[PDB]
Amino acid sequence: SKNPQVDIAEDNAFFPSEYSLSQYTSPVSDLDGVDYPKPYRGKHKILVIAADERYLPTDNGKLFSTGNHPIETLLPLYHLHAAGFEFEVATISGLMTKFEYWAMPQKDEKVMPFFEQHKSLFRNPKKLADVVASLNADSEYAAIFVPGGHGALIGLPESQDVAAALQWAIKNDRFVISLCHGPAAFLALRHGDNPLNGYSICAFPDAADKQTPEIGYMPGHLTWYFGEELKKMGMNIINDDITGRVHKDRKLLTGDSPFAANALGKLAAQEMLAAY
Amino acid sequence: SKNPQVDIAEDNAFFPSEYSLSQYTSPVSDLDGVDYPKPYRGKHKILVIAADERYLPTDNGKLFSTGNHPIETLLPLYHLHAAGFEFEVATISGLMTKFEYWAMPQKDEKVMPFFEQHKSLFRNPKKLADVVASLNADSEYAAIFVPGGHGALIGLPESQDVAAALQWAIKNDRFVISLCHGPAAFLALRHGDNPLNGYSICAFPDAADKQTPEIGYMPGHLTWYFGEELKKMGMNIINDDITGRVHKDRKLLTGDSPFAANALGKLAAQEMLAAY
């Protein structure tokens, strides 16, 4: 079935079709290379900038019931966690993180407990402007993580706060991690001062969510395409399709989809393990 | 069956009898009041001083296969974790933590994942002397946790390092948490300078492990009784029996057995949540 599914909680909102839900999600994740015997004992923690809105408006007025992608959020954080790095969630507003539970790997003996044990952190997130105002060369963060999910497409791309946050990190030689539509957040720098210019990155292809609606993943088409906007902001998007590969470009680690979440996690842990 | 059980790994070592193993352990724990919506976002982490030796010598030459008690180690750490506080394990030697796996709640859907996700921290612990040498009024610890298990009876009670560590905490108004035979570690102050003098505490009763061997919990009797030694060091031990109750005495939070692990955890989280 490729028909979008009603989300009774909102006026004209829809979840992904049964066909696509089984096409791109699973009751169990690919969590894999969690081998880290010499864990980081420092004090630096990953800063996770998440989405506080679940509904994204499409071309036909219907709302898309999205949010942050669990796999893209939890797999990386899982590896980074087991590697000794703790994480602190923040939202532009401070409202709770909005997840796409339809892509949550219920029935995963490792990912769910991990989630349950850090749920409060997403539920009672910090307001990004508070975090930003305390940012100094000594801020103990080590990296900013912007997880995927169409939710990242709302809010973050026009946030003066996500901008500052990012400029602070690249300025202070910190890592920046992201995947799926998360880089759409980098668009918050398009209005002058873009320390993320000539950086190569791999994200979700515009051509991908150009067609996904043809199978009901979305109740309609996107109002715009973040991919080409990044191209105009001077960033290089490696992939033109969905391949599940991840790329490293001097502290900038990224992936193109739920398919690259595990690899992006290993790449992150192993790379920061070395830096710290 | 009250007969001690051979531990083929050591010369004349024995695990607790089947009767006592079912008397004092369970495949599932009492982990309970894990309700913490406003978690600590600071940087202070609990400092866990654990045992690096598994075998304790008894009155009859037989070795007792003990170590750190999982429940007394993991329940408190579980609550403190979900409350936003991270922990860092240390051993006098730096050798891996030695647990009493015969008391590990295999089959516990929450405690085992928690364990698995922080196993490395116990496996590759830090050497307490290294931690001590960096201790200053700014050390970001907030509390020192000395978990129970007869393992705490070996090494720690004569450690110049556990002593310094403890003096540093009470001096710097930090918390000190412990249960079972863990307070036996406080005996490391008996030789002058005991900021733990007139403090009341509840621990495992001498009379308890005076009789436990009568059912095979231990292959023999203890070479000495830490309980009375604490009494002589000027500390007040509330309980005279095993009751599973926990006590608070100005930053000193303690419990008397595996039975008080959950409560000691709630008391710890809730009390530090307030201090931080």
Side-chain angles (χ1 to χ4, degrees), chain A residues 3-7 9-17 19-34 36-37 39-40 42 44-85 87-106 108-139 141-159 161-192 194-210 212-213 215-276, chain B residues 3-7 9-17 19-34 36-37 39-40 42 44-85 87-106 108-139 141-159 161-192 194-210 212-213 215-276:
Chain A
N3 280 171
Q5 309 192 71
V6 181
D7 177 334
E10 183 66 42
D11 174 76
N12 272 289
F14 298 86
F15 291 118
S17 70
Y19 171 89
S20 51
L21 272 189
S22 52
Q23 183 68 287
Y24 302 131
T25 77
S26 175
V28 178
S29 73
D30 296 15
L31 183 60
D32 187 49
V34 184
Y36 306 110
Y40 171 62
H44 292 61
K45 305 173 69 184
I46 310 287
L47 199 202
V48 176
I49 295 178
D52 41 353
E53 178 63 63
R54 161 171 287 112
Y55 303 95
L56 181 68
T58 57
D59 69 346
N60 59 197
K62 302 169 178 285
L63 268 4
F64 177 30
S65 180
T66 179
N68 266 312
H69 191 106
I71 299 165
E72 305 181 357
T73 303
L74 303 175
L75 290 206
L77 257 25
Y78 194 91
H79 282 86
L80 287 176
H81 178 78
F85 302 99
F87 68 105
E88 183 178 11
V89 194
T91 265
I92 293 181
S93 70
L95 295 178
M96 65 188 217
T97 311
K98 302 308 189 298
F99 283 115
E100 289 164 334
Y101 289 104
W102 41 259
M104 180 65 86
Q106 271 83 45
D108 174 315
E109 309 283 38
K110 293 182 176 180
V111 172
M112 299 306 317
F114 174 65
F115 175 56
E116 288 302 314
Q117 303 184 188
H118 301 86
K119 184 183 295 184
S120 182
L121 295 168
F122 288 106
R123 250 258 235 312
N124 205 334
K126 240 162 178 49
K127 179 177 180 181
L128 184 52
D130 302 326
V131 190
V132 175
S134 278
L135 253 35
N136 54 269
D138 268 38
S139 291
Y141 274 128
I144 286 183
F145 173 50
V146 186
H150 287 273
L153 256 29
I154 165 281
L156 313 188
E158 283 88 30
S159 186
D161 296 301
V162 304
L166 297 180
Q167 300 169 318
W168 166 77
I170 296 175
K171 172 192 171 195
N172 301 162
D173 184 33
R174 291 291 196 299
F175 291 86
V176 173
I177 310 167
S178 190
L179 69 177
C180 192
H181 299 74
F186 303 165
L187 278 61
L189 298 165
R190 59 186 147 137
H191 299 298
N194 173 31
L196 215 43
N197 195 187
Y199 276 75
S200 302
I201 244 172
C202 69
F204 204 69
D206 277 354
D209 42 38
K210 187 83 66 185
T212 61
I215 63 176
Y217 192 98
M218 302 193 282
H221 290 87
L222 298 177
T223 292
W224 54 288
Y225 291 83
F226 94 101
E228 243 242 7
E229 291 315 78
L230 283 169
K231 180 186 179 58
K232 260 109 83 308
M233 193 181 85
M235 295 190 77
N236 172 51
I237 292 192
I238 314 301
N239 63 135
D240 85 335
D241 55 353
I242 158 186
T243 184
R245 293 204 64 182
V246 40
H247 180 74
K248 152 57 182 305
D249 177 13
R250 58 205 196 298
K251 293 283 210 306
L252 182 69
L253 333 176
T254 59
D256 70 6
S257 60
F259 292 107
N262 196 70
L264 189 280
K266 309 207 283 184
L267 176 77
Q270 292 163 52
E271 204 70 51
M272 288 192 252
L273 235 19
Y276 291 92
Chain B
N3 280 171
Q5 310 192 71
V6 181
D7 178 334
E10 183 66 42
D11 174 75
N12 272 290
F14 298 86
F15 291 119
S17 69
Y19 171 90
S20 52
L21 273 189
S22 52
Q23 183 67 287
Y24 302 131
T25 77
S26 175
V28 178
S29 73
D30 296 15
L31 183 59
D32 188 49
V34 185
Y36 306 110
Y40 171 62
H44 292 61
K45 304 173 68 185
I46 310 286
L47 199 202
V48 177
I49 295 177
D52 41 353
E53 178 63 63
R54 162 170 287 111
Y55 303 95
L56 180 69
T58 57
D59 70 346
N60 60 197
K62 302 169 178 285
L63 268 4
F64 177 30
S65 179
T66 179
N68 266 311
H69 191 106
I71 299 165
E72 305 181 358
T73 303
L74 303 175
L75 290 206
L77 256 26
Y78 194 91
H79 281 86
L80 287 176
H81 178 78
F85 302 99
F87 68 105
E88 183 177 11
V89 194
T91 265
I92 293 181
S93 69
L95 294 178
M96 65 188 217
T97 310
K98 302 308 188 297
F99 283 115
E100 290 164 334
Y101 289 104
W102 41 259
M104 180 65 87
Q106 271 83 45
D108 174 315
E109 310 283 38
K110 293 182 176 180
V111 172
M112 298 307 316
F114 174 66
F115 175 57
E116 288 303 314
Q117 302 183 189
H118 301 86
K119 185 183 295 184
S120 181
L121 295 167
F122 289 106
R123 250 258 234 312
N124 205 334
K126 240 162 178 49
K127 180 177 179 180
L128 184 52
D130 301 327
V131 190
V132 175
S134 278
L135 253 35
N136 54 269
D138 268 37
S139 290
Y141 274 128
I144 285 183
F145 174 50
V146 186
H150 287 272
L153 256 29
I154 165 281
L156 312 188
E158 283 88 30
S159 186
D161 296 301
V162 304
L166 296 180
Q167 300 169 319
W168 166 77
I170 295 174
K171 172 192 171 194
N172 301 163
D173 185 32
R174 290 290 196 299
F175 291 86
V176 173
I177 309 167
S178 190
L179 69 178
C180 192
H181 299 74
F186 303 165
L187 278 62
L189 297 165
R190 59 186 147 138
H191 299 298
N194 174 31
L196 215 43
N197 195 186
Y199 277 75
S200 302
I201 243 172
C202 69
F204 204 69
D206 276 354
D209 42 38
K210 187 83 66 186
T212 62
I215 62 176
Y217 193 97
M218 302 193 283
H221 289 87
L222 298 177
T223 293
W224 54 288
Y225 291 83
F226 94 101
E228 243 241 7
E229 291 315 78
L230 283 168
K231 180 186 179 58
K232 261 108 83 308
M233 193 181 86
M235 295 190 78
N236 172 51
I237 293 193
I238 314 301
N239 63 135
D240 86 335
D241 55 354
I242 158 187
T243 184
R245 293 204 64 182
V246 39
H247 180 74
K248 151 57 182 305
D249 177 13
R250 59 204 196 298
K251 293 283 210 306
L252 182 68
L253 333 176
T254 59
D256 69 6
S257 60
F259 292 107
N262 195 70
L264 188 280
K266 309 208 283 184
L267 176 77
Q270 292 163 52
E271 204 70 50
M272 289 192 253
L273 234 19
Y276 291 92

